Design an enzyme around this catalytic site. Structure first.
Site, PDB file in Angstrom:
ATOM      1  N   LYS B 565      70.612  89.258 -72.366  1.00 45.76           N
ATOM      2  CA  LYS B 565      70.569  87.800 -72.598  1.00 45.76           C
ATOM      3  C   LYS B 565      71.318  87.479 -73.876  1.00 45.76           C
ATOM      4  CE  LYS B 565      66.120  87.156 -70.118  1.00 45.76           C
ATOM      5  NZ  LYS B 565      66.349  86.286 -68.948  1.00 45.76           N
ATOM      6  N   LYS B 671      66.717  72.922 -68.086  1.00 48.58           N
ATOM      7  CA  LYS B 671      65.732  72.166 -68.832  1.00 48.58           C
ATOM      8  C   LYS B 671      66.358  71.479 -70.012  1.00 48.58           C
ATOM      9  CE  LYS B 671      62.806  75.895 -68.808  1.00 48.58           C
ATOM     10  NZ  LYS B 671      61.836  76.723 -68.108  1.00 48.58           N
TER      11      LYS B 671
END
Ligand code: G1P
Ligand code: G1P
Ligand code: G1P
Ligand code: G1P
Ligand code: PLP
Ligand code: PLP
Lengths: 833, 833
Positions: B565, B671
């Site tokens: 990530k 989001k």
């Protein structure tokens, strides 16, 4: 069975209010609909509506003691044998009839729903049911009293018979929830285990301890129609979030969480022995735990009193005895004594000698037995590991105690070893009974023989040092559950004649003496007892498929299975009856149903062998065609409070057959006296005060008195002498010895016969002859109906004394120093302040 | 912050009704009084009043599907990352403003009380939050859908930093209770473990198994203003009363009860890894358990359908696919396939070949990753012990599968070993992903790149046998929680212009394109974002005592800590920024607050080393006087859903920095797009469909595309080449190597430097240069306010596609075969039938 007794008022606005709130809890609380709901769902809708009628007063009773700030009684017990809660709450609140109406109107049978509630089986027998009936009477007498115990997950096992053998299984009482408790996680406290003591500067400080948390759960205890609702606070163990995980070095993350239920194991299961001592670590941890957290809760609400207003040149713990009283139920909470000393000397920093005067003035101890195997002697090696400061406090207390004894009994060297709280031998132990007499200001027995025996035999040394400490308070039974609740009809017919003031003033039953020759009372008493026997006869055939004749004498022995309680002597009597009719078949004998019930603790091989004998006797006896209905022997599976409430009202004869000197009180004997059973019994425990109360003519006493048991012990008990002299007894030994009762298993009862013959501690054969004679005398009376019922009216009218309200009014007065009251507190409410 | 947006109607009768029921639950439910109650007590009084407004519709929605009997969707997941429930229920029920009024009138602040609720942390990251947002969208679209999972006692650990190190502790979320679940002990089912298979006569029968019980707990899932309330059924493990005790031979009675929490350990703790595979027995038992009991619950309510009316010449399981659809979230429920075969062939006795057509037509699988370490390969040796019939069913399925493959690809011998569900090596394993493609009728990826990569790389063989099985459904986010609920102001200012129909039709946000050059909209968008940054700046300083400058770019990376990530690439960027201003102090740079948060799974040493680096960078950077407020680096402790709801509305820049080809979708990226953050990101996962949706000009894409990563792998990634060519990168390696960031601990980061240098699987140095260039470009725009906000309006207006309502309307249509609806069901009620 048409019902409608004075179970209160079923009045219009209230029945309206009730059906309405039942239907709201079914929808909103149960999230169940009228088409999907089962009898369990409906039991809960009613349990929840009835709990609602009680929260107003519980809140009101708790803010009320805050305000008027009385002396508070803390009854510490490791057992509370509560049984079921719906009906009893309705009785104490006056809601029984209003809710019966409300429920019939919703189309349900209340009694169907009450059978749905599981028992709170947090006890083993008498000691735990004592605690329970004390709770009811303390709130009925307006006392600011709190029962403090452990919230066990699994109560006493559920007993199962498989091939006449007891099979134990877990009592998952909480499977479905508990509408009665209110978890209080806000109020969680930590209990410390293990550790070191560092002696640094001015003080010991117990350091390096594991912390367990005690999370409280309170259950309301409503007094009988007086609006007082007191609190039973039961602790549950919870592992901490940090050390049950946090400290750094690999072991395993998942494992560190799986190991939390290890700290949480302290409240998982009740230790299962009536009158035996288990020297296991888990038991001592249960005992420290409950003492630890309760004392925290006591000190807190003492500091909040007018000290947390004026700490009167610091919090003066001097008024601690005048605000606190803690009753130790047996030695199981005895750690309360070195723990109140630990908090006072170590944390609060008083003088040893000031803290000791304070501890003694607040602690008092109830002794529940004389038999040595039940006594607690905790090996020093495990108090040293698990609780190393409390061992130091106990060695110090011992020291100062024996320094008193030496000064009083100078030169008397065996006195001093006998008195010591610290017992040498290989395993050096700590005598906990000795700690409680030393550290309490009152010690008491539970029946007048028992209290005399403590003064004279067991704690003689202690009586000679401090005579004034020893007291007596004979046990009791609560008339609400043990009369109104289990026997609504008997209470009714008494209520018609003498009124209702007796449910909280049982001495008024003496006024019933006047009705002994009244034929209306004599047929109603005889009528209730046949109604109850028919209801139990039917429970038996539905719930347990057995079938018994309701017209026979219902002869019942129900209590835990132990050698001293003598189910073996009663079995010897049943086999005599069996054989006296097998030799003379066409001889008429009065017919009886002999019912024996009770639980054996799991590894007590003798008691487990006694239950196999009884079922073996019933295998023979119940299928003999020559016997017919004249004799059936029945073992009563999974005995506990809800089963006692249905079988005690249906008994004609009560068996109370222990060797004189062994049953300290007994309370099943009182429950049965209240409910129209006659007692066949030795002069043991409270049987002596019951026969004195009713008169010996109205009682069936037999056997050796205590004197007689000692005379025999000096002499030497030889069971062969009785085998030689009684042919009928001879005959039964060889029926057991030679396989009559275990055909395909013939050698099966060889150690009960061997124990009887060579190792009988409770000398069963010695009371046999006089017991079968006393048994001929009760059948003589039974076949004369009108005269059994008059002896019955004589026992019921004489039950007065044996209410727990009297016992608690005496504890209050002569030990706690509070005056009972009966003024109804002005609850309920509506309001908020 | 004056508030009053369209959180619904605060209308007179309702606010009345509410205060009233709050005050009833405080007294009656909480057994607390106005003078003793704390903010936790009051949180519960409100949680309970709001639950009351939902039971009417839950009951109505459940009897409604019974009646009209639709096809039912069962979404099987081992994780459900729900976060908190009060506010979201008020949003979906229209109660937010009525309850804010009601509470201010009782004198309380609602937002104070909502912070009291603990998170339902039953998940690890994206896969579990996906499940949660799918639940919300399935009920908002009127689907008869049921989420089925495990009710874990301890959710994902709570992260703690001690000296910049992560300290894990137990998430005791249930300590205080759960006002939202309804335990259902009535409906407990048994799950079988271990055993034998006997082959007797016509059938295998699995015999000698240990039984565990699965006790259900249902939580309501309300759709957004449509009166549908669906059910999340979470199983808890319970030990049986008989074998957890009963079988005869000494071991120990107390021990036999203490060993029950051993069976009850199956639901005790969530397994804590995002994207890793744990080959531990307890995990496989959690996986069988949840599958076992759910399939029982499925078959039951299928038999009750019009078969339990007409079993149409016996219950024809032929309509099972037309009444049942079960979505496997990842391979964690893959045992559903040999278990539906076990019940159908073994118990229900259909033909293998009939049961197989039925299983395939009802099962479908969502694949969540490509990285090989996350894939499940369960060693045959433990499926053999613990589940011996399901291993036989899997060997048989394998057999028949490869017989198809051989017939299709005849002669192709490496195909067959590659396709096998059974993998040889030393430890022979079972490839669970292979089992799910074989046994499901649809397989899908969670983003269009990801779905193409499965067809082309990972399940190429499988695409060539059954091309039609492979589908795509890009992920989504629920606009209710992830916009209305966390960003009431942004939703408000959008609501003013385009109305409210967009909370259930997010595509309408495109209508906001028209306002991109409207100065009223451009200052209100810029205003909301400063209000949110000031509220988060203040949360930070109160709750966590940190202090940050609200006028800087809030640069945030929040997700689980994993190497792919790339929090390390972002840390390399932060140290560049630090050093470019330490060499040129009085040069103006745009100021930023770099916030990185996320949890490391406990034994992933690299991720735990990454959190120590970040805190080490903040130790340096945050106390450099030459730096001043221009740069602060902040680690964001104990990240989870409630913290995501407060930090995502306050972000200016979103970091979405994974090596292209590694993040299958990502949903934090959506989001943030919804909430006025601009994305700096590689062309990975759904970042590609988001930049396509907003246009590449309105997005900050950099780095290697997938092609580029493969070209480098053929070539050979050599991280030294980048050390040689970039002096700034050179410089940082020696700052880490030579202790600048760990002074008194100088060798401390030696394996992150070593891994970067020699073992970088995710080739961090290769995207560095192009990433620091893309970072110069976002600060250029930030210092031009009006133009950042227009790029922001371009991302928010383009969020449409990324709602989970679209994703679920596509699952429904193209996989489950149901048509979504939005017609409000006519609930609530009053009534009973
Ligand atoms: O343990 P305490 O404080 O005496 O008892 C506790 O529960 C009682 C009944 O709700 C309250 O009235 C007390 O204020 C509360 O703190
Ligand atoms: O637990 P058990 O034996 O039933 O009960 C024990 O305490 C009871 C209550 O004081 C006494 O009545 C018993 O005599 C005693 O042996
Ligand atoms: O698992 P089921 O039967 O579909 O769902 C269960 O809870 C629902 C809501 O109370 C009821 O309406 C059902 O009748 C009940 O049996
Ligand atoms: O558990 P994680 O890694 O956050 O989430 C995992 O499933 C999510 C939902 O499909 C995807 O968005 C992620 O790309 C994947 O890696
Ligand atoms: C009262 C009671 C006891 C005590 O019985 P005793 O005959 O005194 O030993 C034990 N068990 C139950 C269920 C009781 O109700
Ligand atoms: C949405 C969410 C996730 C997923 O984040 P990604 O950036 O997609 O990996 C993880 N954790 C929380 C708390 C979330 O809300």
């Amino acid at each position: 069975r048409k019902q409608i007794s004075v179970r209160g008022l079923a009045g219009v606005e209230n029945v309206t209010e009730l059906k309405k709130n039942f239907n709201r809890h079914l929808h909103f609380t149960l999230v169940k609909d009228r088409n999907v709901a089962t009898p369990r769902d409906y039991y809960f809708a009613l349990a929840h509506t009835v709990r609602d009628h009680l929260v107003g007063r519980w809140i009101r009773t708790q803010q009320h003691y805050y305000e008027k700030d009385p002396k508070r009684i803390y009854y510490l017990s490791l057992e509370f044998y509560m049984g079921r809660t719906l009906q009893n709450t309705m009785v104490n609140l006056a809601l029984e009839n209003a809710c019966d109406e409300a429920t019939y109107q919703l189309g349900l049978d209340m009694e169907e729903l009450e059978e749905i509630e599981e028992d709170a089986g947090l006890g083993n027998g008498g000691l735990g049911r004592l605690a329970a009936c004390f709770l009811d009477s303390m709130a009925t007498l307006g006392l600011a009293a709190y029962g403090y115990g452990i919230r066990y997950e699994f109560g006493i096992f559920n007993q199962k018979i498989c091939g006449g053998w007891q099979m134990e299984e877990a009592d998952d009482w909480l499977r479905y929830g508990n509408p009665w408790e209110k978890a209080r996680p806000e109020f969680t406290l930590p209990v410390h285990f293990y550790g070191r003591v560092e002696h640094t500067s001015q003080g010991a400080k117990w350091v390096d301890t594991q912390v367990v948390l005690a999370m409280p759960y309170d259950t309301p205890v409503p007094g009988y129609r007086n609006n007082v609702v007191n609190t039973m606070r039961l602790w549950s163990a919870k592992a901490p979030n940090d050390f049950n995980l946090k400290d750094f070095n690999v072991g395993g993350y998942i494992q560190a969480v799986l190991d939390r239920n290890l700290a949480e194991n302290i409240s998982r299961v009740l230790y299962p022995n009536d009158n035996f001592f288990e020297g296991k670590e888990l038991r001592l941890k249960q005992e420290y735990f409950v003492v630890a957290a309760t004392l925290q809760d006591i000190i807190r609400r003492f500091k909040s009193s007018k000290f947390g207003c004026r700490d009167p040149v610091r919090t003066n713990f001097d008024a601690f005895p005048d605000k606190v009283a803690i009753q130790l139920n047996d030695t199981h909470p005895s750690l309360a004594i070195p723990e109140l000393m630990r908090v006072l000397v170590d944390l609060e920093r008083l003088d040893w000698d000031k803290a000791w005067e304070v501890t003694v003035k607040t602690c008092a101890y109830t002794n529940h037995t004389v038999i040595p195997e039940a006594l607690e002697r905790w090996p020093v090696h495990l108090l040293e590991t698990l609780l190393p400061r409390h061992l130091q406090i106990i060695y110090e207390i011992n020291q100062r105690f024996l320094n008193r004894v030496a000064a009083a009994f100078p030169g008397d060297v065996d006195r001093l070893r006998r008195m010591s709280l610290v017992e040498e031998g290989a395993v050096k132990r700590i005598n906990m009974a000795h700690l409680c007499i030393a550290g309490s200001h009152a010690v008491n027995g539970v029946a007048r023989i028992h209290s005399e025996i403590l003064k004279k035999t067991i704690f003689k040394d202690f009586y000679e040092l401090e005579p004034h400490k020893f007291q007596n308070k004979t046990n009791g039974i609560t008339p609400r559950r043990w009369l109104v609740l289990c026997n609504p009809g008997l209470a009714e017919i008494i209520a018609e004649r003498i009124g209702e003031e007796y449910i909280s003033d049982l001495d008024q039953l003496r006024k019933l003496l006047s009705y002994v020759d009244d034929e209306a009372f004599i047929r109603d008493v005889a009528k209730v007892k046949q109604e109850n026997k028919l209801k139990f006869a039917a429970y038996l055939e539905r719930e347990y498929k057995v079938h018994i004749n309701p017209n026979s004498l219902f002869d019942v022995q129900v209590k835990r299975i132990h050698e001293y309680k003598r189910q073996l002597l009663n079995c010897l009597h049943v086999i005599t009856l069996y054989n006296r009719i097998k030799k003379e078949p066409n001889k008429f004998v009065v017919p009886r149903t002999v019912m024996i019930g009770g639980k054996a603790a799991p590894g007590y091989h003798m008691a487990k062998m006694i239950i196999k004998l009884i079922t073996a006797i019933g295998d023979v006896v119940n299928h003999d065609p020559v016997v017919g209905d004249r004799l059936r022997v029945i073992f009563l599976e999974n005995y506990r409070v809800s089963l006692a409430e249905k079988v005690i009202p249906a008994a004609d004869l009560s068996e109370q057959i222990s060797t004189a000197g062994t049953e300290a009180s007994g309370t099943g004997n009182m429950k049965f006296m209240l409910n129209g059973a006659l007692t066949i019994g030795t002069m043991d425990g409270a049987n002596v005060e019951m026969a004195e109360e009713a008169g010996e003519e109205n009682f069936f006493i037999f056997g050796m008195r205590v004197e007689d048991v000692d005379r025999l012990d000096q002499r030497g008990y030889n069971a062969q002498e009785y085998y030689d002299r009684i042919p009928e007894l001879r005959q039964i030994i060889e029926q057991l010895s030679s396989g009559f009762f275990s055909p395909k298993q013939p050698d099966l009862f060889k150690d009960i016969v061997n124990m009887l013959m060579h190792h009988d501690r409770f000398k069963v054969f010695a009371d046999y002859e006089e017991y079968v004679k006393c048994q001929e005398r009760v059948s003589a009376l039974y076949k004369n109906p009108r005269e059994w019922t008059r002896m019955v009216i004589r026992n019921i009218a004489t039950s007065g004394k044996f209410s727990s309200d009297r016992t608690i009014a005496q504890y209050a007065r002569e030990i706690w120093g509070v005056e009972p009251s009966r003024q109804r507190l002005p609850a309920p409410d509506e309001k908020i302040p």
